Amino acid sequence: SSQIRQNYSTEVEAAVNRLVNLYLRASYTYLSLGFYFDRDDVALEGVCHFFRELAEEKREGAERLLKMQNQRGGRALFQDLQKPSQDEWGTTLDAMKAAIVLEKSLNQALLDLHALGAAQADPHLCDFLESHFLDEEVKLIKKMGDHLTNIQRLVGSQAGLGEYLFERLTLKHD
Amino acid sequence: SSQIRQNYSTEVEAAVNRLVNLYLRASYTYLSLGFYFDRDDVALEGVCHFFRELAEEKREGAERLLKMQNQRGGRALFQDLQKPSQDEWGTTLDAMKAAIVLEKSLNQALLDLHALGAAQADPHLCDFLESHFLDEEVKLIKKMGDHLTNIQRLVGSQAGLGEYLFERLTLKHD
Amino acid sequence: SSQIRQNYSTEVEAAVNRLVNLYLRASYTYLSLGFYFDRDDVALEGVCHFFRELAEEKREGAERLLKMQNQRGGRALFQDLQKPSQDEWGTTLDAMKAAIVLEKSLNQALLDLHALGAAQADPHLCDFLESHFLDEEVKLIKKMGDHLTNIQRLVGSQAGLGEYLFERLTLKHD
Amino acid sequence: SSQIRQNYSTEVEAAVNRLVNLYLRASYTYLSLGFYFDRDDVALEGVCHFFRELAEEKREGAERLLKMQNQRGGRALFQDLQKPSQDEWGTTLDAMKAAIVLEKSLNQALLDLHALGAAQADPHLCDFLESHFLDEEVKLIKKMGDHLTNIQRLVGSQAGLGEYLFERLTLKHD
Ligand SMILES: [Cl-]
Ligand SMILES: [Cl-]
Ligand SMILES: [Cl-]
Ligand SMILES: [Cl-]
């Protein structure tokens, strides 16, 4: 049993475990997106690298949450990780739209947990999210929005050409 | 149109644009103060440099606010920038008193925007101000207070001598 | 009062203050253009950086003019800074057309002030503009003209594609 | 006889020789000022160094004029150099007032020669003065004005104290 727990509600403990599940689900989704764009019949290396990087970022987020759970004297509880929502992710545009939807859902879960921490007068939780998650999420959604706009301007009437150019000239590749 | 905006009220968007206007007005005021102390008939280089540095700091503050406005999916809207309140700024003491008045007004606008963000449950906004503005402002007002006290102790009966010494021995110059 | 002023007409002093206002207005316009191209629904980083750089150049021009005003024993007088002419700046082409219009107006104000200095037999003023402004302005307008031509050749029937390519392959970005 | 002279009037040739005489007279005046402030009963090292530096600057100005006279195919003609106007130069304030008077007379001679060159359509002469003399003179007069203002603020009721402090804290010394 914990000898350290102080000002750490059962509600926050549970919500932190749910959020870990959401981050790991997001990581898994990004793993699937990354490997889809590595298929020989898709072959957009920059897109693959973008999503693989995000899989790592989301796993790291989950790990930070689990570290914090222990720091507060809460108990990590893991659940089944649902498989991603799709097996094939369509075009770069389809994929980036799906990623922004996912990110907005994570962001809402962050905001909801912040509000619960504020209601419970748990400033450590609130600070933790502010310091390590809220701005990271805002920055990422801005980046995805910027990408979506560029991808959309490139569709025009020459969709394949635009998809190639975006991958070659915006996204990081070898 | 924005595809990223989330948890970002129209009230906060508008107040952020007002605050940008206040920072730019403050920058302009400091530009005028800096060049006043560079006049051949005023000639207090350290005072000039102090206010020119502040003009840059305030412009940078405005730029950070504008970057954040975009990160959140709000829309920058610029207004007329009113000219500074004075064309001539009197003594170093007069100028530092005017600067502290200006700083307290900026600080109050920061606190008001923080309170609005708290009321709107917008923790990203609240964190942003905490992290980049509130302590910077407290530190600056402390510095100005410290200067005012030194300037005031130096007036005595030999005001010109004191004004020279403060500029030479407290403020940074070549 | 000044003990240094020599061969420096009231007409030139006033015109220098007007020109400072024009440079600062131009800086403000470029600030607005820069942040417009940073919007998530515009997202042309190279265009954003081009105009932000110009905002800094124009502010530096104003600062040089103010330094010179003091060097000659004139008195800086600041006016209200009008807001930019537009809140949204359209396409890269629209924006670059607006920038060239702005630059031509600044250039004309430089030429007018040079002519006034020549009429007043003020060679220091004339030299100052020659040395720090006239060629800088000619070079900048040439660069903008070169950009406009490239942007125009890229419109064709695939306007989005051309706008992306210009930003990626001509303008400086990360 | 010259085989190079082109577009170089006898009027400008003569005025250039007069200006050389004025620069050398100014150098001599500064030599006298420098050594006055090195007297054991005056003993203001920073003031001494300021004026000795100016003696060198004025001699260098004369040398540049003489080089240019030869470059244009004119003929240097030297006259008697009148001794400085005073044998003793009073206070630092008296001396700096005398220096500004001297500088304004040199500046007027520069402006007069520029106007003659403009009237004679001699752009090389005009450029030469612009490039090597007019701004140097404006900068120096600004510096002297700045010094005068500081010296004047330091007189107060404690003139000796102020004169010492100005020399110690504004002027360059060992
Ligand atoms: Cl189970
Ligand atoms: Cl308006
Ligand atoms: Cl007004
Ligand atoms: Cl003789």
PDB file of all heavy atoms in Angstrom, chain D residues 48 50 74 107 116 126 151 159 167:
ATOM      1  N   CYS D  48      42.201  65.715 -21.545  1.00  0.00           N
ATOM      2  CA  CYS D  48      43.417  65.757 -22.321  1.00  0.00           C
ATOM      3  C   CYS D  48      43.345  64.743 -23.472  1.00  0.00           C
ATOM      4  O   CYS D  48      43.536  65.077 -24.632  1.00  0.00           O
ATOM      5  CB  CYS D  48      44.625  65.492 -21.429  1.00  0.00           C
ATOM      6  SG  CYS D  48      46.142  65.155 -22.345  1.00  0.00           S
ATOM      7  N   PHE D  50      40.747  63.285 -24.862  1.00  0.00           N
ATOM      8  CA  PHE D  50      39.695  63.616 -25.812  1.00  0.00           C
ATOM      9  C   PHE D  50      40.223  64.617 -26.839  1.00  0.00           C
ATOM     10  O   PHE D  50      40.048  64.442 -28.041  1.00  0.00           O
ATOM     11  CB  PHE D  50      38.487  64.203 -25.098  1.00  0.00           C
ATOM     12  CG  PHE D  50      37.319  64.618 -25.957  1.00  0.00           C
ATOM     13  CD1 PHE D  50      36.439  63.675 -26.452  1.00  0.00           C
ATOM     14  CD2 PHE D  50      37.064  65.944 -26.202  1.00  0.00           C
ATOM     15  CE1 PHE D  50      35.380  64.048 -27.252  1.00  0.00           C
ATOM     16  CE2 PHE D  50      35.986  66.322 -26.997  1.00  0.00           C
ATOM     17  CZ  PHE D  50      35.128  65.373 -27.478  1.00  0.00           C
ATOM     18  N   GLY D  74      45.136  69.061 -58.803  1.00  0.00           N
ATOM     19  CA  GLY D  74      45.336  70.344 -58.174  1.00  0.00           C
ATOM     20  C   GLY D  74      46.690  70.398 -57.457  1.00  0.00           C
ATOM     21  O   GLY D  74      47.399  69.403 -57.328  1.00  0.00           O
ATOM     22  N   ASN D 107      32.336  72.693 -40.073  1.00  0.00           N
ATOM     23  CA  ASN D 107      31.180  72.127 -40.738  1.00  0.00           C
ATOM     24  C   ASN D 107      30.637  73.106 -41.777  1.00  0.00           C
ATOM     25  O   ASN D 107      30.346  72.717 -42.908  1.00  0.00           O
ATOM     26  CB  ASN D 107      30.131  71.713 -39.720  1.00  0.00           C
ATOM     27  CG  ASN D 107      29.129  70.755 -40.317  1.00  0.00           C
ATOM     28  OD1 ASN D 107      29.488  69.884 -41.080  1.00  0.00           O
ATOM     29  ND2 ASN D 107      27.887  70.881 -39.933  1.00  0.00           N
ATOM     30  N   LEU D 116      29.802  74.794 -53.490  1.00  0.00           N
ATOM     31  CA  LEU D 116      30.611  75.251 -54.608  1.00  0.00           C
ATOM     32  C   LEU D 116      30.797  74.092 -55.584  1.00  0.00           C
ATOM     33  O   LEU D 116      30.609  74.240 -56.802  1.00  0.00           O
ATOM     34  CB  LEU D 116      31.963  75.767 -54.104  1.00  0.00           C
ATOM     35  CG  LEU D 116      33.021  76.085 -55.150  1.00  0.00           C
ATOM     36  CD1 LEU D 116      32.559  77.197 -56.075  1.00  0.00           C
ATOM     37  CD2 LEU D 116      34.330  76.523 -54.507  1.00  0.00           C
ATOM     38  N   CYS D 126      31.901  66.553 -54.403  1.00  0.00           N
ATOM     39  CA  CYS D 126      30.705  66.440 -53.581  1.00  0.00           C
ATOM     40  C   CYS D 126      30.668  65.092 -52.899  1.00  0.00           C
ATOM     41  O   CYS D 126      30.436  65.052 -51.689  1.00  0.00           O
ATOM     42  CB  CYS D 126      29.427  66.679 -54.381  1.00  0.00           C
ATOM     43  SG  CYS D 126      29.275  68.401 -54.902  1.00  0.00           S
ATOM     44  N   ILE D 151      28.042  67.849 -18.928  1.00  0.00           N
ATOM     45  CA  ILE D 151      28.886  68.741 -18.140  1.00  0.00           C
ATOM     46  C   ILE D 151      28.020  69.780 -17.435  1.00  0.00           C
ATOM     47  O   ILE D 151      28.206  70.018 -16.243  1.00  0.00           O
ATOM     48  CB  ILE D 151      29.924  69.415 -19.058  1.00  0.00           C
ATOM     49  CG1 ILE D 151      30.964  68.424 -19.564  1.00  0.00           C
ATOM     50  CG2 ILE D 151      30.568  70.579 -18.299  1.00  0.00           C
ATOM     51  CD1 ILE D 151      31.711  68.881 -20.810  1.00  0.00           C
ATOM     52  N   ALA D 159      30.895  72.592  -8.515  1.00  0.00           N
ATOM     53  CA  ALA D 159      31.463  72.588  -9.865  1.00  0.00           C
ATOM     54  C   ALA D 159      32.692  71.675  -9.965  1.00  0.00           C
ATOM     55  O   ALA D 159      32.878  70.974 -10.945  1.00  0.00           O
ATOM     56  CB  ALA D 159      31.792  74.000 -10.283  1.00  0.00           C
ATOM     57  N   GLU D 167      34.976  63.703 -16.027  1.00  0.00           N
ATOM     58  CA  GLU D 167      36.237  63.204 -16.545  1.00  0.00           C
ATOM     59  C   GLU D 167      36.439  61.728 -16.195  1.00  0.00           C
ATOM     60  O   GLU D 167      36.891  60.957 -17.043  1.00  0.00           O
ATOM     61  CB  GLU D 167      37.416  64.104 -16.125  1.00  0.00           C
ATOM     62  CG  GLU D 167      38.725  63.565 -16.625  1.00  0.00           C
ATOM     63  CD  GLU D 167      39.467  62.587 -15.738  1.00  0.00           C
ATOM     64  OE1 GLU D 167      39.185  62.602 -14.531  1.00  0.00           O
ATOM     65  OE2 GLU D 167      40.303  61.833 -16.255  1.00  0.00           O
TER      66      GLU D 167
END
